Amino acid sequence: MKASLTFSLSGIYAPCSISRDIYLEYGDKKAECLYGTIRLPQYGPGCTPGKIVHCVLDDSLPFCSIVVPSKLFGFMPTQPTMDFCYFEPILDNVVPVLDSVTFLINEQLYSKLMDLPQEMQQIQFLHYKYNINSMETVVHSRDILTSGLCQILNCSPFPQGLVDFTETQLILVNDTEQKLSALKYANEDEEYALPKIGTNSALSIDLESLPCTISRDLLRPAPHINDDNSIYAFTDAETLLRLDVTSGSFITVSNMGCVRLVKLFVLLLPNGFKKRTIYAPPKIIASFPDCSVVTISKSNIGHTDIPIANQVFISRVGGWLQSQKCFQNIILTTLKKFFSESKRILCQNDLIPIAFDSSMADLNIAEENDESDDEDELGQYYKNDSLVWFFVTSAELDCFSKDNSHFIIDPNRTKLITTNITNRRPLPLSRSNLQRYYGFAETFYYDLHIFPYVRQLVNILETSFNCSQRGITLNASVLLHSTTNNVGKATMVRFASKYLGIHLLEIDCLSLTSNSRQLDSTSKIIGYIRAKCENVLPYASPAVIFLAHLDSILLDVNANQDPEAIKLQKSINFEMSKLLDDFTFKFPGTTFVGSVNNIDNVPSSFRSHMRFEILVPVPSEAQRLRIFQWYLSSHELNRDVQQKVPVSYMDNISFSSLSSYSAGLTPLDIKSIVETARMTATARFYQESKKCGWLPQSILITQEDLSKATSKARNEFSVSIGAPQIPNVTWDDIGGIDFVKGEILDTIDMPLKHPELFTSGMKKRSGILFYGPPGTGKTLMAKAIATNFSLNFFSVKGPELLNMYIGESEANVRRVFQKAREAKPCVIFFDQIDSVAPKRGNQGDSGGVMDRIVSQLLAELDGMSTDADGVFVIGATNRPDLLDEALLRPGRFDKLLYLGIPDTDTKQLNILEALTRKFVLDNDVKLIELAKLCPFNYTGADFYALCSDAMLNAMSRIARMVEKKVSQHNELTGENISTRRWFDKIATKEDTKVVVKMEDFLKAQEQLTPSVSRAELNHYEAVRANFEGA
Amino acid sequence: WCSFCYWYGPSLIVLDNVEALFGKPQANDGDPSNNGQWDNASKLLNFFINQVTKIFNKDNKRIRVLFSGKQKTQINPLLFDKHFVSETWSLRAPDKHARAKLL
């Protein structure tokens, strides 16, 4: 509900107070004090999370009104205040008590508390200082305690709740941090820092634009006339009180150009805006393009002057989002609506924004003319999603007039007259956004330090026009391509265009292409591009033309296809190349952007007509940290959920723990992650919504749901060859268990640059070729290190993915190493190299009908290995007799690394016990050492086969115990029947609780469980590891 | 279809046999070159996914879609690659008790 909002200078922790009507109607006597919730009229689409409030009766307050302590929000009497709120009483009175709170305090009072000998002295002094009362005090994280001096950091479990001094654990913090000086409430500032002056000519000061529109009910002075925000402008009372007006009735503006007329309004305290500017709708900033930033004027121009235009011409500004044929009906309709709905003020040489809903094709609604209002209700079931400019000429005003620069249009009198083109520069996004104001599906945004190649493309386009045209012309063409196929490369253009104010045309010739049959539809494609562009390219001042998916059109030439079709390809290639230059003849300053998903398929016959190309890689850690910040920022996460309850993350999120551990190689579409989380978080919210113990009144994301989401995203893509980073537990890189473990870390610690920022260009990498423990271990070993000192395990799966097809399979090697390197930091596991089994040309593959894997692997990954960065090998060879030793040598991939199998003296017996753990051994004695009754040289993975046999023996014991219980089940059932029901309906715990007490690991071991290997083959490995494996 | 869908508010679409509209031919051999990744049907599928994705990002309440088919993998590559699909189910040969109720 809405209630009248008012303020007091009372302390932040004092109770609010409510008008007698609210107190009598909603003061439930089951509670000593009425709890409630507040929200304010925040600007824009979002909303603040509803803040709990505590209140008391006051019969003096006007009907349906609230007083709140100004310092709760940080308001001050130095500026005009708000007047109404969203409120609710907390029905059912239940409110959570916080598990803990953290406080941060200046050094003086911090030390004065920390040196106190007892807890209650600290508590009571805090109570005195801040008027905090146990149980009753409402608190939120980031709440102020005193500006300059102390603040409330965080709360648990919820970010808001009640404090109990006996059970809310109190955490007290100081660090002398200068951030205390940044505590300034919402205001604390002496305005006389601009000293008073008796008169001024124009008060020229910076003009800027809002991040959003302003809802009409916010318009505090509320002029009675129905009139348009498009004429309104908004700023503080500061500077306004330096004029001789408030809520100014008449303002006019010019900045070394034409004049605009505007109306002024005051912005209120809750904003986070600049301390000094005027904020305007973009309708202003369509004038003064990218400049003209500072000058205004105010005078009594008139209350109802300029009331007509006898004739005008109004114009399409033109643009691909405008000039295409099928949108015309709705744009013209909403255009006439813009003039029909009210009188409005216009200037000569002036721009009106108009927006519409796409996909309104075929649907015409307002078939009946006039009648009762309907357009506005559709206009609130609509919400706009594409935006275009219309331009109006000067009015042909009758007779002589001193006013010759501005005019009013209204539904009566003169009609709209359309005219062909009026070319105009699109606004640069850094001067003012537009999408944000209209809340459209938003062009992503960059900071130019972290992404290189956006800066590259920017530097191309920014120079080729504006900075060039002072001199001789220069066209440009660029091709964009990427190894990975979802990299967002099209979105790059959507960005850079708006960033540089480049007028964009974009072409969906991927499929919107008529008959388009490559092998038949002869030339229609070329007509489709040419005749389309020709109708819209002329009289666009800059121009970039962007084609999606050139692989739809261009293709290679091969023996496999009809020469007739090949000559069709030839014709299309040639005419495309000619039209590409023809734009450079007919339409000066045109620039061309191509995009291709696989660079090889465009023949060099076209590729020669590049001016540049860019490899766009998959992003890396610093980029991913930026990109998650985007998706989890408030306004983009919210705007599409129409549900009134807002959504947010909470700042305990670890963007760094996402950035790598959670993100690996993942091929963008992090969107999929954030949406998967948003669903799951919403589910638990609607779960508790079933009148459960509390309702935190906001959807709150949590790290656990991000972890679940990312792990799901690695397996829902079930075809994916990859693997997660953490297949390892209890085995976290125990570098002290043996010397060899003490040396695996060398190959990772060094390229982690901890010894130096290595040159990436001298010493060959100490990649490891692991004999290790030859019999068993290797399956674990690489995974164990990979999780605990590295970051992924995407691995070559070495036996698979050799393509049989003629001359193809080099593609799979080049792809696998590309996909490996595409994750910056982590190894590839390689099985036995017998997965490749390179074997020098004889007694096998014989190097003839197959060479394609090894003939690549000898080279390209060794090139990377010699630059010695990012990616590392950890192969697990056992049978070098099967291999050619063209690798496995000091010249390429050295460090033939051996460990052997421990003879009998092992801590690994203790670690065997430690991993039979997680399941109970009832004995007090550990009884492990009797396993050493095994004859020596035995210590293989069969340790855990023996734990399996012991567990199965416990299972057999409990199985025969339940069989005995079944046999006597007549003791509690009329028959020894229904066993499959009985165990479930009795279920007296006893849930397979483990019985390792029977020590049956020896009872297995004494059988000489022959899956162990102990033969001379082990001696063979043990000797040859030294004799040849070194 | 999309035009009607946006009109009727919260709405749902199904396609009883998606294989006919958007099944990639299983032979993987419509052309030997890379453009086998964009035969005519897959071209339709991409157009559809683009339209839907664009309207969906405006307001997720408005349209969902159900695809019924033969084998969850065998529909189409692009359908998974773009993360258009997600939450999923399958029917299984009914158990004896339900089998009795059916009979």
Ligand SMILES: Nc1ncnc2c1ncn2[C@@H]1O[C@H](COP(=O)(O)OP(=O)(O)OP(=O)(O)O)[C@@H](O)[C@H]1O
């Ligand atoms: N790094 C990113 N930054 C911003 N938006 C991104 C990013 N990665 C993906 N997206 C979003 O995903 C979509 C990417 O579409 P786009 O056409 O640019 O590429 P794609 O479809 O993955 O590739 P292709 O052009 O090869 O078909 C857009 O909606 C874009 O906003």
Ligand SMILES: Nc1ncnc2c1ncn2[C@@H]1O[C@H](COP(=O)(O)OP(=O)(O)OP(=O)(O)O)[C@@H](O)[C@H]1O
């Ligand atoms: N040194 C060890 N300490 C403890 N457990 C070990 C050890 N070596 C092997 N194991 C057991 O065996 C697993 C790792 O070795 P495993 O028997 O799986 O290798 P493998 O299959 O012979 O290896 P490869 O990949 O070379 O074929 C571990 O998960 C553990 O159960």
Ligand SMILES: [Mg+2]
């Ligand atoms: Mg794309």
Ligand SMILES: [Mg+2]
């Ligand atoms: Mg193994």
